[PDB]
């Protein structure tokens, strides 16, 4: 890991929050060396991200330097497109609508630069309809630079220069998974395909595309720019770079947080700036990620850093980078039960494992929060969570076992005392 | 609730404005022709923008625009959440309840809205326009239990905002589309400054 | 004509035998010596199906509503 840091400085990959959020002249960071970057060929950028080996901030590994170079057929006769996500579907993420808040010029910096690696034709970005004021300024941020003759259709200095076509969903599902977005980009109902047909860079819209995240392509200008010998900065030799965080739950200041790989959460969450709940001698029961990570008590996770294998050394790792706690006042069972209640109101409905397996649980998880009659249903409720893994298509089958499967772990007198109270009350 | 039509208005009618037909030209120009074939996500939502809630006669209209079968449109409008088929109000309010918003003291930004307003919970107002729903997953749980409106959002909620936003909109004011208190810029507060400078020598791209 | 029971003569009327093959099918109608008529076994097209061909660029097989 090195020196247990993961500091915070001003030499970052973000421009700045409070400096200027509107249109501008791209003062120092943006459009610094514009045409000289894409003057070279694709192999100058293909494998260039291996200096970081950026894993990808969508919610999994499979490094974004590898998916652009490898698993990328050259050409047969048909065009190619780019699909950049912007939907934030994990609850309490806030990693988006902060990049679009103050730094919108950076996203078109590497849109044309990232598409040169694939050689795609057009760029389709996808914003949630609910974020309407920020997405209104995004199309204004097009006309500030793109209309000014800097980009498209041959600008600048290259035969490769293209557009960015903004769409919106309404209330959709396609955040948490690809292959439902390239279906909902068409007009169909967004009930997703199988994920390996012929996976997403074989069968797409009409012709093969790519799926990336916001800071999977927002860091791509400066990672191709600063590069190094800096791209391995913090953490071990597994993960490398600096990733965006957020602090939510119980804090004096729940605020946006920026750091690098493998910081211990005991000194990271208490910093920036107040840890207003019980820092110790209360519970401070923590969740590693957004929704694909179950509970941890006050045990070794506070000594464990934020490496990918550090949480995989524990029961569950996470890539959503969202921190939520509940020390004293909150009921433990009550909070996560409304996160299983969440999945009933987003899930697709195709596969009989996910549909009519979540509702098997949501009917009975609301019984455990009440406190009711005889236990040993817990192991049955544990088995059903053990029975949705490879059965569903998308990750929301796998993202619905995990808040159950870890609540059943780690916590013996959760409802053994609660159901005792109602068994005593009925007595 | 149900999702069926017991023949309220088969022919409402609902035709578009000649200002709106030329905006349909721009959308079809984006998509590649042939597999264009469905621009139904902005086209049907543009019909929501003119009306406010779209009846069944609006669904039959866009099929004749895009030469699709009609059942291809009845389907899609009943999946996504934002579209509205029942009648709605002038101000459609959303109280974003989730797990961290439950932890962020939604409890007072819960009821005591109805003690402030006087309606049933989760229900439209009996008169005209206040219609109350609750939604999930929009951005910041790093803020308070924020309240979105049809054009913006209200960060940093509190019962004083319940005493304000409900109150000021009954007279028709604009109750602060943003964080009403706290940090105006959503900063680390103890890490906010970080020595604002040019970003430490741009030009490592020699390589 | 007292109830409606479909009464009958024709004392065979309920006999199915199960033979293993055509080669030993006709070898029983001759040994007891009655006439016959032989059908044929029908097995379907092999055939060509491929999920992932339901999404096209210029072809005609492209499904929706799923």
């Amino acid at each position: 890991f090195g020196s247990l840091k993961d500091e915070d400085r001003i030499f970052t990959n973000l421009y700045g929050r409070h400096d200027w959020r509107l249109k501008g002249a791209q003062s120092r960071g943006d459009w610094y060396k514009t045409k000289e970057i894409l003057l070279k060929g694709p192999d100058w950028i293909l494998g260039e991200v291996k200096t970081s080996g950026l894993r990808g901030r969508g919610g999994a590994g499979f490094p974004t330097g590898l998916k652009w170079s490898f698993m990328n057929k050259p050409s047969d006769g048909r065009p190619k497109y780019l699909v950049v996500n912007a939907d934030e579907g994990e609850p309490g993420t806030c990693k988006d609508r902060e990049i679009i808040r103050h730094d919108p010029h950076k996203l078109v910096e590497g849109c044309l630069v990232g598409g040169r690696a694939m050689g795609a034709r057009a760029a389709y970005i996808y914003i949630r309809g609910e974020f309407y004021n920020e997405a209104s300024n995004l199309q204004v941020a097009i006309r500030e630079a793109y209309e000014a003759g800097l980009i498209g259709k041959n600008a600048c200095g290259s035969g490769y220069d293209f557009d960015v076509f903004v769409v919106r969903g309404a209330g959709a599902y396609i955040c948490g998974e690809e292959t439902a977005l390239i279906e909902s980009i068409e007009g169909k109902q967004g009930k997703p395909r199988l994920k390996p047909p012929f996976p997403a860079d074989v069968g797409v819209f009409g012709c093969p595309t790519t799926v990336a995240n916001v800071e999977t392509v927002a860091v791509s200008p400066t990672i191709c720019r600063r590069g190094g010998a800096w791209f391995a900065s913090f953490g071990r030799e597994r993960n490398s770079g600096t990733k965006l965080f957020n602090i939510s739950g119980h804090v004096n200041n729940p605020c946006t947080v920026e750091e690098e790989m493998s910081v211990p959460l005991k000194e990271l969450i208490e910093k920036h700036a107040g840890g207003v709940t019980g820092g110790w001698d209360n519970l401070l029961a923590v969740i590693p990620g957004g929704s694909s990570t179950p509970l941890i008590p006050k045990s070794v996770c506070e000594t464990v850093l934020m490496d990918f294998d550090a949480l995989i050394q524990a029961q569950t790792g996470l890539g959503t980078a969202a921190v939520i706690v509940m020390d004293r006042s909150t009921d433990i069972v009550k909070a996560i039960a409304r996160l299983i209640e969440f999945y009933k109101h987003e899930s697709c409905g195709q596969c009989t494992p996910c549909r009519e397996g979540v509702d098997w649980m949501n009917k009975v998880m609301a019984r455990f929060v009440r406190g009711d009659a005889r236990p040993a249903e817990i192991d049955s409720l544990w088995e059903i969570s053990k029975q949705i893994e490879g059965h569903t298509i998308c990750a929301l089958g796998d993202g619905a076992a995990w808040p159950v499967q870890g609540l059943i772990r780690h916590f013996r007198p959760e409802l053994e005392e609660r159901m005792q109270q109602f068994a005593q009350q009925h007595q | 609730v149900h999702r069926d039509t017991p023949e309220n208005n088969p022919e409402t009618p609902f035709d578009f404005t000649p200002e709106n037909y030329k905006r349909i030209e721009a959308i079809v120009k984006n998509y590649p022709e042939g597999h264009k074939a469905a621009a139904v996500l902005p086209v049907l939502d543009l019909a929501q923008r003119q009306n406010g809630w779209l009846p069944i006669s609006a669904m039959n209209k866009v099929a004749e625009i895009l030469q699709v079968p009609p059942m291809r449109v009845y389907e899609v409008a009943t999946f996504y959440t934002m579209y509205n088929r029942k009648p709605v109000g002038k101000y459609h309010i959303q109280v974003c309840t989730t797990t961290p918003c439950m932890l962020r003291n939604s409890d007072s930004i819960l009821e005591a809205i109805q003690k402030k307003l006087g309606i049933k919970v989760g229900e439209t107002t009996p008169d005209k326009l206040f219609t109350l729903i609750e939604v999930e997953c929009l951005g910041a749980c790093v803020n308070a239990p924020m309240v979105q409106i049809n054009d913006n959002y209200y960060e940093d909620l509190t019962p004083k905002d319940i005493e304000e936003i409900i109150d000021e909109l009954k007279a028709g004011k604009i109750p602060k589309p943003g964080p009403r208190s706290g940090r105006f810029s959503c900063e680390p507060a103890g890490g906010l400054t970080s020595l604002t400078e040019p970003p430490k020598g741009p030009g490592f791209g020699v390589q | 004509p007292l109830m409606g029971w479909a009464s009958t003569a024709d004392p065979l009327s309920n006999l199915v035998l199960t033979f293993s093959t055509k080669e030993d099918a006709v070898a029983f109608a001759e040994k007891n010596g009655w006439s016959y008529d032989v059908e044929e076994r029908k097995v379907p097209k092999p055939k060509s199906k491929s999920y992932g061909a339901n999404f096209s660029w210029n072809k005609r097989t492209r499904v929706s509503t799923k």
């Binding site: 097009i142 | 120009k29 998509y31 923008r49 | 660029w57």
Partner: peptide, 28 residues
């Protein structure tokens, strides 16, 4: 911060330059 006024976004300057489109065919 305005519920309407999408023609400023949609067809104001993005109608002059699309660009181009060529976009292929796909008749089908």
């Amino acid at each position: 911060y305005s519920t309407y006024t999408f023609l400023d976004l949609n067809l104001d300057l993005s109608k002059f330059r699309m660009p181009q489109p060529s976009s292929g065919r796909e008749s089908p």
